[PDB]
């Protein structure tokens, strides 16, 4: 399993799905609560990026199981997707963190 996750091809596909549900997946609301946390943490000017682990299993859950099994690499992927969301919602919020 971990060797399969190690493939950067798999990692990039997961990155695509991660960016997809990050803003596109607006669970139970007309707006993505994760997108709401984005640029709010930007306003807070912090680095945490809380997820709650929910709306993840609720969002097709394959990413959820993948994380639960082999986190570290897709945590790094989450950090990357955080970078793109960062500069997206707040341009220039890069190089702050």
């Amino acid at each position: 399993y971990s060797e399969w996750i190690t493939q950067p091809n798999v990692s990039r596909t997961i990155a695509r799905e991660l960016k997809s549900f990050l803003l596109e997946y607006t669970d139970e609301t007309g707006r993505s609560v994760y997108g709401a946390r984005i640029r709010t943490l930007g306003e807070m000017n912090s680095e945490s990026l809380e997820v709650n682990y929910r709306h993840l299993a609720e969002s097709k859950a394959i990413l959820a199981l993948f994380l639960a099994k082999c986190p570290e690499e897709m945590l790094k992927i989450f950090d990357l997707v955080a970078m793109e969301a960062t500069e997206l919602h707040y341009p220039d919020y890069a190089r702050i963190h």
Binding site: N45, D92, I96
Partner: protein, 568 residues
């Protein structure tokens, strides 16, 4: 047209020859307290006189009756008295109650020589012709701009002078109607006193960098009161700068070298010498645009700051301590972001001057420091005389600060400006959250009863600054139309209310034609009307008609009359 623009130099030479006595002083200077442009003009006159070595006494005044009693104190031999921007509209001669026949020496051909000749340069617009033309002792410097436009009014006034029949009666009545047409008009200013003073200097050709610099400062002071006038005079100031720019280009900065630049300025108080966050924080225009008074204002401020990508702790730290690597890029960053927020109109070119390695100081920063030093540099009527003395002292302190060597005093005024902006912000947010404004659809009414700094607030300039901030806040709220601004403050030491009647003002950047027409302060006429009948013992001795001191108990009937008054 008592004094032609070109004839200003001729009048100046006449004043010289009248007071051409190095042995004996024949010149006295009377200046309105609490006016930046007045201080600039006084500096102008002082430098001119020290060029001519003419003996002179300089006196700061705040009250009209103070002017009268001082004039009583004055010796008749003084053939030269100058007035700076105060009382021009009111008939000073009537206020002075002078007899020209006493004053005229050798009436005969006819010439009018007086042992005291009083020359009045006024910034106020109504410009009473009888004040201008009733007495030759009253010497009025005329911009011409009002005077030529007053040609119909001037000829009507002349006809009234001639006629002292039904057809002639109705003609006189029509002339009186015209008088009332330019009467009942809220006085304003269209000419920064420094501007025409420097024009006269150019006529004499004695202009230096400092003269133009001080003219810039006076105009910048006028900017908030009349933005459009500042904008109109701005190209003239820039052109004169070019006229006086040194030939040397981009020379290495050395302590001897002093340079004044025309570079983009951001409508943030003390921006260079304060931080970024704070400069945004107490900026009245920024506050009104962002509603910073409320918590959501702060939220939006943090959002926009992060939009520039500026780290917070970096933002609250001072501009001077900022790394230049970001400091250079700031302007384009705002260009990219302010527009997205609509805050782009705040960027505009300004005059910032530097000397040696002291640093560059905005003219806006300079005038803010001057205003601060004026405000807080230092029975009940006796207490009010004490406050007038302290205000004169603050005037002298600001005068002294204009000198280059008192950079330390300038920094003190800077600190006072920071503190005053902070306190004004606190008071404004307090009244806004508590909704202490109570608009009566004739005028938005707020009053000061509780809270600290009322002693600071009863200082007229502090009240004026708070009024400007609240006018800016209301105007940026375009949902509610422009309405008169009335503000009343209490002093427990005097136990009577302090009132200033602020005319409504368009938001900055409002170049629409309906915003081109200025607003006239109906407050002044209402106050004069109340003084005329059923007066509540208000004080109008102050050179500002809008600012009025009233018994706290008698203010409620005053408000009732204001509601009754239809001119508001």
């Amino acid at each position: 047209m008592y004094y032609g623009i070109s004839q200003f130099s001729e009048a100046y030479n006449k004043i010289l020859r009248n007071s051409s006595s190095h042995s004996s002083c024949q010149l006295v200077i009377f200046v309105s307290c609490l006016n930046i442009d007045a201080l600039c003009a006084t500096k102008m006159l002082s430098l001119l006189f020290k060029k001519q070595l003419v003996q002179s006494q300089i006196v700061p005044i705040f009250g009209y009756s103070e002017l009268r009693r001082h004039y009583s104190q004055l010796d008749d031999n003084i053939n030269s008295l100058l007035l700076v921007g105060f009382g021009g509209v009111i008939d000073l001669e009537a206020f002075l109650e002078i007899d020209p026949q006493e004053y005229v020496i050798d009436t005969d051909s006819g010439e009018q020589s007086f042992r005291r000749d009083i020359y009045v340069l006024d910034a106020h617009r109504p410009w009473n012709l009888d004040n201008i033309f009733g007495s030759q002792i009253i010497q009025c410097f005329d911009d011409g701009t009002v005077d030529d436009t007053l040609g119909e009014q001037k000829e009507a006034y002349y006809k009234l002078l001639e006629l002292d029949r039904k057809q002639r009666k109705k003609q006189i009545h029509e002339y009186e109607g015209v008088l009332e047409e330019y009467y009942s008009q809220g006085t304003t200013v269209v000419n920064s006193i420094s501007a025409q003073i420097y024009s006269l200097l150019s006529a004499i050709g004695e202009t230096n960098l400092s003269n133009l610099w001080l003219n810039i400062l006076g105009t910048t002071s006028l900017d908030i009161a009349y933005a459009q006038v500042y904008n109109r005079l701005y190209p003239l100031l820039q052109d004169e700068v070019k006229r006086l720019t040194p030939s040397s280009r981009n020379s290495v900065k050395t302590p001897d070298t002093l340079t004044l630049n025309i570079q983009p300025d951001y409508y943030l108080f003390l921006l260079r010498h304060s931080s970024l966050y704070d400069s945004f924080y107490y900026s009245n225009y920024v506050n009104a645009k962002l509603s910073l008074w409320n918590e959501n204002g702060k939220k939006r401020l943090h959002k926009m700051f992060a939009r520039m990508g500026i780290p917070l702790s970096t933002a609250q730290e001072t501009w001077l301590y900022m790394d230049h690597s970001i400091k250079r890029e700031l302007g384009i960053i705002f260009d990219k972001n302010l527009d997205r927020y609509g805050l782009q109109d705040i960027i505009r070119d300004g005059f910032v001057r530097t000397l040696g390695y002291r640093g560059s100081i905005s003219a806006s920063e300079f005038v803010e420091a001057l205003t601060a030093l004026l405000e807080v540099g230092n029975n009940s009527a006796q207490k009010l005389t004490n406050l007038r003395k302290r205000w004169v002292s603050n005037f002298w302190l600001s005068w002294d600060a204009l000198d280059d060597r008192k950079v330390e005093l300038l920094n003190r005024g800077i600190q006072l400006a920071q503190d005053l902006q902070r306190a004004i912000f606190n008071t404004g947010v307090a009244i806004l959250e508590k909704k202490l404004i109570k608009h009566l659809r004739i005028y938005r009414l707020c009053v000061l009863q509780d809270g600290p700094d009322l002693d600071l607030y009863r200082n007229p300039l502090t009240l004026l600054r708070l009024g400007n901030w609240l006018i800016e806040c209301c105007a940026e709220s375009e949902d509610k139309q422009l309405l008169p601004m009335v503000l009343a403050s209490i002093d427990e030491n005097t136990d009577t209310y302090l009132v200033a009647g602020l005319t409504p003002r368009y938001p900055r950047g409002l170049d629409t034609i309906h915003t081109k027409k200025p607003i006239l302060n109906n407050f002044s006429m209402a106050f004069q009307q109340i003084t005329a009948e059923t007066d509540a013992k208000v004080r109008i001795d102050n050179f500002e008609s809008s600012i009025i001191e009233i018994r706290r108990e008698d203010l409620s009937p005053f408000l009732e009359k204001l509601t009754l008054s239809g001119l508001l």
